[PDB]
């Protein structure tokens, strides 16, 4: 549903910010 | 022993004339026949010593005391034959079965392997195997019931799968053309459909009617084989996939004041209303002039009841099943 999609998107953003850490910002 | 077990068994129960009475309940003698879980049992041998006696059954000794031989020895058989006297035309030709080269434990675990199973033409108790077969699609369409022969004798006596049991139904058809009643309605003789089986939910609790209940959670996800690590040294599963960590993950393709707490029924029960009321139909007219026409052992008959069911149905006028023809 929308709630599960929002939490899954939060997880995906967390994994991205764990992978992108150190190089863009 | 001996005298004590005998005379206290005679004292506790002279009334068991048939069979064998139970051994006495005493601190001296033991009750061998009673059940003693599996976490209370001691592993003993035939003799009755806590000791094992196999290479693969946990013993420090195998064979006849670490010897491949036996107490009786072994003696080969003589076998003489020629043109004048042959072995194959002998009256008592002793064939070579693979059971005289077996030991008593070989015979024991061989008959242990000989499991008992019910026959395919007759259903046994609790045979729960058709649910996975039926819910398979085309495999369940091709694979059919294993022709338990009660079903096929029912086919013999005139019954068909897909409909139930009862008198003939004089219903016309459903052609599938909607609900057209303009058909001639010449009403062939048909059979009643099967009533569905009742599958009652298991009630292990005192939960009330209509209560869905507190929902329960779920755990968060989750050349063939090896020698093994022993059943005591296994502890718990310290032999995983040696190559890669973790259980494999399932992968998605894409991303008056009433009582307190008691409510009042807004409308009454209909039959606690019609118990006062007169009903939905009047009594008959009963005109004057009608009058009553008549004015105001079983065991012994069962002893002489020699009427066979064939003549019984003949005099009672019931149609019978076709026999052997």
């Amino acid at each position: 549903d929308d709630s599960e999609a929002e939490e899954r998107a939060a997880y995906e953003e967390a994994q991205v910010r764990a992978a992108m850490d150190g190089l863009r910002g | 022993r001996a005298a004590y077990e005998a005379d206290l068994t005679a004292q506790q129960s002279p009334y068991v004339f048939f069979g064998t009475p139970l051994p006495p309940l005493d601190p001296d003698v033991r009750d061998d026949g009673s059940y003693v879980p599996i976490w209370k049992q001691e592993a003993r041998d035939e003799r009755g010593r806590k000791r094992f006696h196999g290479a693969f059954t946990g013993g420090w000794s195998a064979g006849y005391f670490n010897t491949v031989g036996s107490k009786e020895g072994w003696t080969p058989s003589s076998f003489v034959s020629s043109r004048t006297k042959r072995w194959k035309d002998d009256p008592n030709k002793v064939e070579q079965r693979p059971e005289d080269f077996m030991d008593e434990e070989d015979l024991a675990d061989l008959e242990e392997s000989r499991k008992l199973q019910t026959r395919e033409a007759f259903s046994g108790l609790g045979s729960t195997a058709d649910d996975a077969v039926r819910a398979s699609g085309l495999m369940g369409l091709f694979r059919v019931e294993g022709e338990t022969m009660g079903v096929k004798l029912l086919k013999k006596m005139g019954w068909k799968e897909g409909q139930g049991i009862g008198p003939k139904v004089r219903r016309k058809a459903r052609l599938g053309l909607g609900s057209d009643a303009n058909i001639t309605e010449e009403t062939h003789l048909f059979a009643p459909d099967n009533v569905p089986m009742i599958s009652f939910v298991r009630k292990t609790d005192h939960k009330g009617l209509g209560y869905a209940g507190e929902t329960g959670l779920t755990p968060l996800s989750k050349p063939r084989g090896s020698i093994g690590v022993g059943i005591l040294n296994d502890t718990g599963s310290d032999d995983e996939d040696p190559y890669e960590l973790g259980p494999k993950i399932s992968y998605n393709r894409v991303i008056r004041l009433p009582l307190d707490g008691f409510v009042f029924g807004k409308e009454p029960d209909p039959l606690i209303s019609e118990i006062i009321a007169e009903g939905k139909y009047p009594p008959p007219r009963i005109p004057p002039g009608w009058v009553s026409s008549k004015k105001p052992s079983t065991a012994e008959a069962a002893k002489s009841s020699t009427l066979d069911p064939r003549a019984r149905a003949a005099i009672l006028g019931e149609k019978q099943l076709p026999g052997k023809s």
Binding site: - | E214, G216, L217, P219, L220, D234, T235, G236, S237, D238
Partner: protein, 97 residues
Amino acid sequence: ILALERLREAYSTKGRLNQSQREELALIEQAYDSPGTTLERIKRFLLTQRAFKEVGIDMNDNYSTINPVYDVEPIEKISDAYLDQYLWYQADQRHLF
């Protein structure tokens, strides 16, 4: 959910567990079956209960150093695992560290 599997990562499915581990496994399965009462009990303990049980202590031997290992009562272990997960989650979202 998360807290429960953390406790259940401590114990393999098979094994020779003594009494307290099987009591803990019973408590974990009870929490899975009845989560609302478990959460309400956890919050009641977290508000109210301020005196706690004995905590066992032993040493684990790495042959060069030994470290103390503390064995805690299972029901307080469930309460602490929930509190641990909640605090780490809320510290992440509120940017504590």
